[PDB]
């Protein structure tokens, strides 16, 4: 989608650390992501979209197919079955793995793009500015 094109650098964050303790994130790596400040870069060819998260702590990189599951190795090394729609022009991504699941979805607003992480009952919300 149009709306999603561009590098994105993150301006702002809450509760992120509360979403990893949730999801299962070890405190040294929690440590070290919570302070990333990244750029994400999003992209599109055809059907397919990437998308390419850049920091001193690590670099990772999806490309998918709307509604086509994938697997994923996330930045925390889950190893996730990742589906991924566009629902009213929100990019909801939903993360599967040992019967548990998180969504993240990924929203532009005004001229930001806005990340809203969901575990459980825990919300965390990432702002993101063009570069
Ligand atoms: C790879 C580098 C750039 C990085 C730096 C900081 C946080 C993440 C990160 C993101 C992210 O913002 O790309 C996400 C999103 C899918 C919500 N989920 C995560 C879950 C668990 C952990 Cl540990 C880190 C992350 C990734």
């Known amino acids: 989608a149009g709306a999603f094109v561009g590098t994105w650098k993150l ?3 809450e509760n992120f650390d ?3 303790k949730e999801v299962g994130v070890g405190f040294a790596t929690r440590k070290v992501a919570g ?4 750029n994400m870069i999003i992209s599109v060819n055809g059907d397919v979209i990437t998308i390419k998260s850049e920091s001193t702590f690590k670099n990772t990189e999806i490309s998918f197919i709307l509604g086509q599951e994938f697997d994923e190795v996330t930045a925390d090394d ?3 079955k990742s589906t991924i729609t566009l629902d ?3 990019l909801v991504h939903v993360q599967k793995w040992d019967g548990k699941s998180t969504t993240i979805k990924r929203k532009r607003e005004d001229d930001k793009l806005v990340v809203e992480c969901v575990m459980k009952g825990v919300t965390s919300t990432r702002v993101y500015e063009r570069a």
């Open 11 to 13: 301006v702002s964050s």
């Open 18 to 20: 509360d979403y990893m």
């Open 35 to 38: 302070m990333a400040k990244p």
């Open 78 to 80: 889950r190893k996730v």
């Open 88 to 90: 009213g022009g929100v």
